Design a protein around this ligand. Sequence first.
Ligand SMILES: [Zn+2]
Ligand SMILES: [Zn+2]
Ligand SMILES: [Zn+2]
Lengths: 199, 199, 199, 219, 160, 160, 60
Amino acid sequence: AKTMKKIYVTMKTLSPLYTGEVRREDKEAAQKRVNFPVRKTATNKVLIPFKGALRSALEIMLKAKGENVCDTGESRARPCGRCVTCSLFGSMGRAGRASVDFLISNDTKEQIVRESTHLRIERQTKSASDTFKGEEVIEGATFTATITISNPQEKDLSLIQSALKFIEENGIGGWLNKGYGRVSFEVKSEDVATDRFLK
Amino acid sequence: AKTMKKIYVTMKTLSPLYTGEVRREDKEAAQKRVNFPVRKTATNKVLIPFKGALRSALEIMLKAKGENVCDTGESRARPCGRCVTCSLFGSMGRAGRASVDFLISNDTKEQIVRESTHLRIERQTKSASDTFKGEEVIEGATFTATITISNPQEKDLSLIQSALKFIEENGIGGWLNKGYGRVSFEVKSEDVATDRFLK
Amino acid sequence: AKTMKKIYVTMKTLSPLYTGEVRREDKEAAQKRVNFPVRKTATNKVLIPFKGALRSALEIMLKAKGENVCDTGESRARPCGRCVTCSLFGSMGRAGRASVDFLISNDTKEQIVRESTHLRIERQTKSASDTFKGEEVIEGATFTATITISNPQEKDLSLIQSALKFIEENGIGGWLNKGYGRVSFEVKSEDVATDRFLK
Amino acid sequence: NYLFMPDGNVDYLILDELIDYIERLKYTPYKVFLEILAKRIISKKIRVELPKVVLNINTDNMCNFASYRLMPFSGFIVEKDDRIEINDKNWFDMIWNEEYNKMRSQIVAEDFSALPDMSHDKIIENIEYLFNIKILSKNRIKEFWEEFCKGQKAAIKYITQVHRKNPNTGRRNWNPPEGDFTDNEIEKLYETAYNTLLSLIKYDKNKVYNILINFNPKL
Amino acid sequence: VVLNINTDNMCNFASYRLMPFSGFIVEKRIEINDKNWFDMIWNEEYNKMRSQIVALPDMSHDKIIENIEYLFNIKILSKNRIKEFWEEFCKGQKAAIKYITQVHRKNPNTGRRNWNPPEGDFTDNEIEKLYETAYNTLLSLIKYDKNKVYNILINFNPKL
Amino acid sequence: KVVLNINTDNMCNFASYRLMPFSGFIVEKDRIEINDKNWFDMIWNEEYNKMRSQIVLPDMSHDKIIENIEYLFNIKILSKNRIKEFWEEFCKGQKAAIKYITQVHRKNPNTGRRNWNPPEGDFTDNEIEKLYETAYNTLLSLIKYDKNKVYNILINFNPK
Amino acid sequence: AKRIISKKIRVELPILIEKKVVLNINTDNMCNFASYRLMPFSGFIVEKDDRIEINDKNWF
RNA sequence: GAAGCGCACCUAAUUUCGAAUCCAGCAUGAGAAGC
Ligand SMILES: [Zn+2]
Ligand SMILES: [Zn+2]
Ligand SMILES: [Zn+2]
C-alpha cells in the first residue's frame, strides 16, 4: 500500500485500426456519412478500450498454461475472486488493483481517422456486390495509456507486458480477422510511493 | 486453445499489382495527380487485403468440390456458421479462428510504387481515345503477412495453402483480368503454444 | 463454375516489337538514353498488354461479321453487358470470365531488347532530317501468357484463337503500321478443375 | 554549461571590457544572454538572444523584405489538448463544409410536425411472415418507428428509400429473404413489405406501437 | 440585431419554422453575417496585407429541375459530377465556374469535352446541344445561394 | 425583433471587427430568434417525448416449490433481485407475473440467450436448459398460489 | 584542429538546441465553433534564425 | 576507315455502389455508530 506500480504504455499502430462508436448519438450523427465510425472523444481524440483486451489476453494465456484462472468472457459469468486475473483486473467483492486507463490517442481525428471504403465481392461475377464506409485509424498513430497498480506484487509487470505482447500478436479493437489492430507497445514502468502528492 | 498456428506468408510480386486506395482523403489528395491510386499506408507501405481473397478462393474451390460452403459474396449474404470457411473466416455468431493480417510491403512507396500511363484505343481509328494514369506495384516486391489460427485443426494449413495457390493462379487484388496481380507465395508454418508470451 | 479453361499462349516474335514504357519514372530515367523505352518489368522482362489487344480484335471481327457487340474503345464508352466480348472481357456490372495475363518474356532485357536508330528523311534532299532512338524486342523472343476462363462456354476458346490469328495478321504492341509487332502464337488449351488445389 | 575566466568549455554566457572577457574564454560561447552592445557582440561572430508545443502547419513563401525575413499570413490558431497549431483558410473551409453537412443532416423534412388500406389482421400476418424470413428485421422495425414518430411524410420517405430499386445496380435496400426463393417471389415479397409498411403508415400511433412491440419490445 | 442573410429554405419542425444555419456574429450594430461576408473580408485582409509587405446565365428554377432530371437520366450529369460540382461550389462561385469551364472545354487537339457521354441514340449535333445545356444549367445553378443548390442537388445525389 | 440567444462572450477580433463562428438555428414566431443546437436538442427531445407520451398453472407440491427454489437459489438462477421482481409482479396480479416469467424465459431466436442468470457450477447444456425450464415451472406454479403463501415462501430466500 | 582550437572553435575528430516556435499573440479571446478552440488571426510568420515566431500588425 | 544526328506532339479523363444484421442482460450489498 506504500508503493504503486505505474506502467506508461505507448502504442503505435502497424496496421489500420478500427474500434467502434459506442455512444448512440454520435453513431447516428456519423452513420449519415460513415457506416462504421471509430470511438472518439468529444475532444476529437480516439479511445480504445484497454482493460478487456489485457484481461482477455491474460485469461487465454493463463488458461493455456494451466493455472486455475476463471473465465469472465461467458454470458453473465461471475468472476471467481481467487485467481491472478481476478486480483489484477477484478472480482465481485474486490476491485482490480490494475486501474487500466483508456488508450487515448496523441493526435486528433483530422490527423489520424480516415474514412474508408470496404467491399463485398460476388464470387462468380467478381463484381462489388456490396460496399460500406468505415472510419479507421492510420498506421503510425500513437496512443497513450497508464496502468496504475495498487499494492503491487512481483509478477504484475511480467503479466502486463506478456498481455501487451499478446495484443501485439492478435490485435486491439475490432476487425482483427481482416488485419486490423496490429500494434506495438512500448513500456515505461516506474514504482512510485503512494504519498507522492502530499506536500 | 493451448496451441496456435502461425502461417508466415511472403508474397513475391511477379506481374504488376494494382490495389485501390480506400481512403477518401488519400484519394482526393491523390486524384489531382493519378486517377487510380494504390492502397498505401501512412507509413508509406503498400496495403493489400488478404482475408477476403483467401475466403473467396476457399468458397469458389469448395463450392466446386461440392462441399457445403455458403456463398458470402452475394449481396447482404449471412454466413451460416455450419461451414468450413465459416470456421476459418467467421460467421454471424462466431468469429474466425484465422486472423489474417494485411499484406504490408517490406519496402516503401518510391521503391516499389510506380506511376503509369494507361490507354484506351479506338477500334476503327487505332488512336488513343482515352488516357488515364494509375499506380502500380512493381515486380519482385515482397509482402509479408501472418495468419494466426487460434483453435487449429489439421485442415487449416492445407486449406490456406490451397487458397494461396488459387491466388497464384487468379490474382490478389485489383485488375486481375488484364494481367495484374499474378504473384507467388512462400509459406513458413509453425505451431506455437498460446502461453509462449506468459513468463 | 466446376471447370475452368487454361489457354497457355506462347508467342514468338517474327518482326521487331515495341510496346512503350508506361511508367513515368521509368520513361523519365531513360529519356537521356532512349527516346522510346520498351515496357519492362523490375525483373527486366518485357511486359505486353494482352487483354486489350484480344478485346479490340474480337470487337473488330464481330462488328464486321454483324453480331451485336459494343464498341468499347470509343472514349468513355460503357460496355453493353450483353455481348460475347462483354462476357469474355467484362462489362461495368460483370467482370470478364477470361482473365488474360500479360505477355511476359522468357528472357531478360539484356538478351532480347536492343537500342535502334529510327529516321525521318526529307523527300526532296533525300537526307536525314530527324534521328531518334527506340528500344525493340528482337525477333525470335518468346513470350508466355495464361488465359484463365472462369465459367467456360463452348465458343470462348475458338473466339480467343480467332483473336490470336487476327493479332498475328495485324500485330501487337506499337508501331503496327511500320511492320513492328508481327508475332506467331502457339495455343495450348487445358480444361482444369476449379477445386484441383484442394488436397 | 552556463556561466553567470573559467577555462572549461562554456556553451552559454549570461551577462568594451565585456568584449575582452567574452573573447578571453577558451573556445567561444554558442549563445550569450545579454542593445548596441548585443549587436557589437554579433559583430564578433557570436550569437545573442537579448531576452503547449507550437506547430505551424502552413505552406511557405518568403519575402526577405526588411532585415528580418517574413511570410505574410492571416490565419487561425487552434488550441488542442497539449499542442497549439496554426492553420490557413482551407482548414476552416473544410470544417465549415463538414459542419454545414452536419447542419442540414438536422431539421430534415418535417420531423415531429395517399396510403393503401388492408385489414389489421393482414398487417400482422404480413409483418409476421416477413419477420421470420429476415426482411422486416428488428433494425428495420426500429427505424420504421423512428421515422414514424417524426410524421407520416418521413416514414413514406424512408420506405421509398428502402424499396427504391436502383437502376444502376438493381438492388433494393431491404434485407434479402432467407430460404429458397426465385426472383419473382423475392420482388413480390419486397412489394408486400412496401404495401404493409405504407398501409400501417395510415394507422394511428398506438395502433402501430402495439403492432411493433410483439416484434420489437425495445421500440 | 440585423439578420442580413437569406430566409428561404425555412423548414417546418413541429409548430416552429427553423433553418439549419452556420455563420458569424459581428459586433459593430449586430450583424449575423454568413460565409460570403467572411470570404470577402478574408480576401480583403489577405490582399491588403500581401501588398503591405510588397456574368451568369439566367435560367428559371423549374427549368433547372427539368434539365438536371434530363441530363441525369441520360447520364451526362452523374452523381460523381454533381458531387464534384458541389464541392467546387462550396469553395466559391469562381472556383466552381472554373470547374465547369474545365469540364465543358472542348480540347482543340482531341475534340473531347470532359462531360460523360450521353446514353442514347443522339447525333453529334444533339450531343453538343445537350453539353451546352449542361453547361448553361450548372452555370445558372452557380448563381443561386448555397441552401437552394443543396435542395436542388439533394434529389439527385443523396450522398452530397 | 431579432433576439440573440447565442452567448455573446468568447468572440475573436479580426480585420478590426469582432467575430465568432456560430452554428445554430433560426426560429420564426414577433421574433426571429437565433438558438443553438442545445435548444434544438431540447425541442427534439420534448417533441419525441411528446410522441412517446402516447404509449399504451402446473401446480406441484408446496414441498416441490421449496426444494426447487432452494436448489435454484443455491445454483444461482433464481436470485434475490429476480425473487423481488417476481414478488412485485405477483403483487400487481398474476397475468403481469405470467408476462414477467414469459419475458425472462423467452429464448432469443437469434442468440439463444434466456434472461436468467447462468447456473453456478459445472452442469451440461441440456441440464442448464432443463434448469431454466424448472425455474419456469416453479415460478409459474407459484403464481397459482395466493398472496400470503407466496409472501411467506419468498421471504425465506429474500428477507426484504 | 590545433589551429582551430587556437581560433577558439571546438573540434571532435570522429547541447539541446531546439528551434522552437513562438506564439507572441494573445489566445484569451478564443471560441468554440465545431469542437475546436479557434481564433482567426492576422499576422506574419517571422523566421529569425534562433526561432520561428508569429507576430501581429503591430510588429510589422 | 571518318563524320553529322539521336529530337518532338496529343491525351492523362469517366462511371456505379457506399448498405445490411444480432444483442442492450444480469448479480451483490440495504446497515453501522454516536451526540
Ligand atoms: Zn477469477
Ligand atoms: Zn457457411
Ligand atoms: Zn458488349
